[PDB]
Design an enzyme around this catalytic site. Structure first.
Site, PDB file in Angstrom:
ATOM      1  CG  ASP A   1      33.637  31.344  76.475  1.00  0.00           C
ATOM      2  OD1 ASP A   1      33.434  32.193  77.370  1.00  0.00           O
ATOM      3  OD2 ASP A   1      32.774  30.524  76.129  1.00  0.00           O
TER       4      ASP A   1
ATOM      5  CE1 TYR B   1      26.179  28.450  78.401  1.00  0.00           C
ATOM      6  CE2 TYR B   1      26.028  26.006  78.256  1.00  0.00           C
ATOM      7  CZ  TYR B   1      25.451  27.295  78.116  1.00  0.00           C
ATOM      8  OH  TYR B   1      24.141  27.429  77.709  1.00  0.00           O
TER       9      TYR B   1
END
Ligand SMILES: [Cu+2]
Ligand SMILES: [Cu+2]
Ligand code: NA
Ligand code: NA
Ligand code: NA
Ligand code: NA
Lengths: 620, 620
Positions: free
Chosen positions: A290, A374
């Site tokens: 990420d 998420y």
């Protein structure tokens, strides 16, 4: 005036103008990363020079560039063309996300796969995911994304409830070509919805919760000066923001009497990887970086008073660049506040008759990011007693798949026909240490058990041992919870009043590290995640544990390459890199939206002070 | 009307009258323990019978007695004389503490030792400590305490700053004889004071802390009925109090729709041991069983609004018996309140456009106890999402010694000449499980790493394995943090909507267990502390992991004796005993009064619910 101040919209607009005038920002160019460079070591010359690092992508296929700009002097310092087959591709651009779904919607192989499943292409969302490096020779040097499909029954539907398993496509987002469509067979699309605001699913909302009111009638105890400099209960620090790392803490120091004592020069979460443990070829390539691949700072949420941050909140609104070099403000992207934290210290003494209680508090600095399904909260805490703590909060919607008939060793069942593959969420904290200055060392401390015998006749003694890590080649360490293993960062040239070196102790949670086979692609690309602790000698260009260009890099960059230099770290300018993470076997309670789970670490003083640092806290 | 209601002052006064009339409470008798007995299994006959268990000590040397009384019927049910050389001595009486200092003040050997050190006997405080069982044959069957000396320079002085090392005495508190005085040599008495309210030490108090105001304008969200029955956010439970264990939680259940589902039948901290790791003969016998030897409930603090408990607080004031059978109220001894606990769940969805945030809360039930120099807070937490958590908070003043010239492998230096011996603080939680009823089983869950190869060609897969513990002989388990080891308590006869057994997962902190040599006295007496997890079959008389009479018991009582029965625990009425603790190497920052440190455990639902249990939480 501070060199650690946040980037301003004016600075970013100046960078854009400098790049444009230099011929580096034509219509085919996109800014994939832009961030301010920290001052070089020993900036005691006061000669401020605000420099920005820029990664420039070219949508026509020309080589990207890495560029450094001086806003102070209005010049391009350097500009290097990148060979991406060698050093890695640039981070994914937000505008490339939509390209994947649009390209597949006209590909005859994709449409044939959807037709076999009686799915309307207008209802099929495609999650655009990073590609990694696997067996496909044609991908070397090309910008690839991989797409997985989910059905949205209507515009407000949660598509995650309806994965289309057995199907994956690969897309070249520069040439706009679908390179491969793989269809391994038809799975039923799970039919129950996962709409967690639908009254049909929630039932009547509770009426039993009475309000909790947290207010500060005289305002907060901290002050903010120069935009981002914090002073709170003897702590001093600067709050930075970078589009890749997110919140960065600079110059963490503690005012001990009349002496401002440094503790940490720079603290950040420098990488985070989410590897999936499902061996299905539909998902066995799936690993999110990420931070390094997507840039978590650019997806920071605007935080709402009363919902996301509760109490007397002070906001920062950092400025980043969009893909064209225009400034963009992330309004209310960072929340800052203090919180009561229970009892700090307490004793009722029979002999003296004195009853004593003091309360604790912590300062909280936090932001939230959303990447696809998420959502992650990043929380930094400073406590009255000198403790520093980090906590990551994981929530959002779990990534789903079909649940195979006859079960799975690598997927949890969440609902009829609906699975959630096993995965990890692993973080790397980079701690550029400065315990009372820059001459630091790391010791590994283990509990020592002793045998009953001479000198220990009753068999009750136990001890501890400390091992100094002297060179980088011996500074790759693993946890040992059973022996109480911790690591102490000390300054051998700065002693407390007992003539012992001052220090701070790192307490880890001792969660499992990367589970993948050591011969796997992800183990090579995320080598940092295979060990709990690394110590390197500080160097200006050693910023990330995974290297500068993580996307589609073949492996080995970052920490394994740095430590091969085998530099002296015994009483030198050092950086600690701590790996920590969650291993997630999804439970039914994680569906349809996941309650927060947490992981983190903390550092506590270890003979840094000459006595308790909180004797001067009042009774309130 | 509830059989789980707190003991009333009237019940205790009735017990006293029943014992007195039966001839069991003459002037030479003392009540060393009194507590209510839980209802026997299957009390569905509604035939309530409030029964109390009493340990009766005799100060003239006659044999003590264990007595059971029925307050309901006004009768003595049973009365047994105890042979204490066999089954252990009764807990220490509060009135015996003063006896030790008073007896030593007239002993010629003690006075000679103090004279050599030029200490005024009127200024010497003696810490009265439990004796354990070691090499002294004359102690078998006698009530012994051991005394360590500290100097109080003036009535408000903290004596802990001035240990008198090299000196220890043993006292028979029934015959009033000093059996031994051991003097191993003169150590300087450390001279700096440790008075943490002295302005000379604190400096000027901080003026920088602004108030934090936590209020509940509509009152709290929980209700209290029948004195001690709590209902809060679908949770239901009864809060008990026992003079040995302290706060005990009964009948923990969760209202899932219209069904009240049991989770835990009884939860308590059933023992706690503090073993010291200094091999000096002055302290090598030192091990506190605060619960079993001293009874932590009887030293519970009265908790002050705004200092100890902050917010909208509801108090319970439990009643205990004094040594003569008179009721004594512990005013404001238990605090109950709810707390905001940050973000519960959050997602911002790109495709649906829905932004969703909910906040978490926890219910807190807590008390504090003080035994000598240490103060311990016991906190039970219930969360909205079904998590149950326990946290112990350790503070107070560390136990001190001289710091030897030339250092020590077993003692930390805190101030010039002042040491603090290494020690542990180890707790045993007894969890009488009732996951959806009483047919429960325990599985050990480990992460499973998989090798790259056929079926796992990219080397990314990982899995988990569960091992059912079927008999008590195989149910003594150790932690393994590296393999992510947890334990699941499930009900094989109660399934969720996916046809999987409902369960709860125990997450441990994986701290070191007892460090002493396995051949030591303390390893035998505190065998529970050598392993992280034990599972037994429920039995009425198996209450404590160390046995009923811990004081001066020679060893082996409790869990090692219970599990030798090798009973079936696979889908039966079972009890989980979890060992957890802190290993304390004192730091300079722990002096002169220690900031709180914490340890605990938690249980999270594992397929207990059919989906997230907090979908009906409102947005506030
Ligand atoms: Cu996850
Ligand atoms: Cu301690
Ligand atoms: Na390469
Ligand atoms: Na450093
Ligand atoms: Na015995
Ligand atoms: Na049970």
């Amino acid at each position: 005036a501070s060199p650690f101040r946040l980037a301003s919209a004016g600075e970013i607009s100046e960078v854009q103008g400098i790049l444009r005038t230099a011929g580096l920002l034509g219509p085919e160019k996109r800014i994939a990363y832009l961030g301010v460079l920290d001052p070089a070591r020993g900036a005691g010359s006061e000669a401020e020079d605000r420099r920005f690092r820029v990664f420039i992508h070219d949508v026509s296929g020309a080589r990207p560039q890495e560029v450094t700009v001086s806003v102070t002097n209005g010049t391009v310092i350097s500009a290097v063309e990148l060979d991406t087959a060698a050093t890695g591709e640039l981070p994914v651009l937000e505008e490339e996300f939509e390209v994947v779904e649009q390209l597949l919607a006209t590909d005859e192989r994709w449409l044939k796969a959807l037709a076999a499943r009686n799915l309307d292409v207008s209802k099929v969302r495609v999650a655009p995911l990073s590609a990694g490096v696997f067996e496909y020779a044609e991908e070397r040097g090309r910008r690839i994304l991989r797409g997985l499909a989910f059905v949205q029954d209507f515009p407000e539907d949660s598509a995650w409830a309806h994965p289309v398993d057995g199907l994956v496509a690969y897309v070249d987002v520069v040439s706009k070509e679908v390179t491969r469509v793989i269809d391994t067979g038809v799975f039923p699309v799970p039919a129950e919805h996962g709409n967690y605001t639908d009254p049909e699913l929630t039932g009547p909302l509770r009426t039993t919760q009475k309000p909790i009111s947290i207010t500060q009638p005289e305002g907060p105890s901290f002050t903010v000066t120069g935009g981002n400099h914090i002073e709170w209960e003897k702590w001093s620090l600067d709050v930075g923001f970078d589009v890749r790392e997110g919140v960065v803490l600079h110059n963490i120091a503690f005012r001990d009497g009349d002496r401002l004592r440094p503790i940490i020069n720079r603290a950040s979460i420098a990488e985070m990887v989410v590897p999936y443990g499902d061996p299905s070829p539909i998902r066995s390539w799936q690993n999110y970086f990420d931070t390094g691949e997507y840039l978590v700072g650019q997806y920071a949420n605007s935080l709402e008073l009363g919902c996301d941050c509760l109490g007397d909140i002070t906001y920062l609104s950092p400025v980043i660049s969009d893909a064209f070099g225009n400034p963009r403000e992330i309004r209310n992207g960072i929340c800052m506040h203090e919180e009561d934290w229970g009892i700090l210290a307490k004793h009722s003494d029979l002999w003296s008759g004195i009853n004593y209680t003091r309360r604790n508090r912590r300062m909280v600095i936090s932001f939230f990011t959303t990447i696809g399904n998420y959502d992650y909260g990043f929380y930094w805490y400073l406590y009255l007693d000198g403790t520093i703590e980090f906590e990551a909060k994981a929530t959002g919607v779990v990534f789903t798949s079909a649940f195979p008939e006859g079960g799975s060793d690598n997927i949890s069942q969440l609902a009829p026909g609906l699975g959630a593959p096993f995965h990890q969420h692993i973080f790397s904290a980079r701690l550029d240490m400065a315990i009372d200055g820059f001459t630091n060392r790391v010791e590994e401390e283990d509990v020592v058990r002793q045998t009953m015998g001479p000198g220990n006749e009753r068999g009750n003694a136990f001890s501890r041992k400390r091992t100094v890590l002297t060179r980088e080649s011996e500074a790759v360490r693993e946890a040992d919870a059973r022996t109480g293993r911790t690591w102490i960062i000390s300054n051998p040239e700065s002693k407390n009043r007992l003539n012992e070196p001052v220090g701070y102790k790192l307490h880890a949670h001792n969660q499992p590290t990367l589970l993948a086979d050591p011969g796997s692609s992800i183990a090579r690309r995320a080598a940092f995640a295979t060990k709990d602790l690394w110590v390197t000698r500080y160097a200006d260009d050693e910023r990330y544990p995974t290297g500068d260009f993580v996307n589609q890099h073949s492996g080995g960059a970052g920490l394994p390459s740095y430590i091969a230099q085998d530099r002296d770290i015994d009483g030198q300018d050092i950086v600690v890199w701590h790996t920590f993470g969650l291993t997630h076997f999804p439970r039914v309670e994680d569906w349809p939206i996941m309650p927060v789970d947490t992981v983190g670490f903390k550092l506590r003083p270890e003979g840094f002070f000459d006595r308790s640092p909180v004797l001067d806290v009042p009774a309130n």
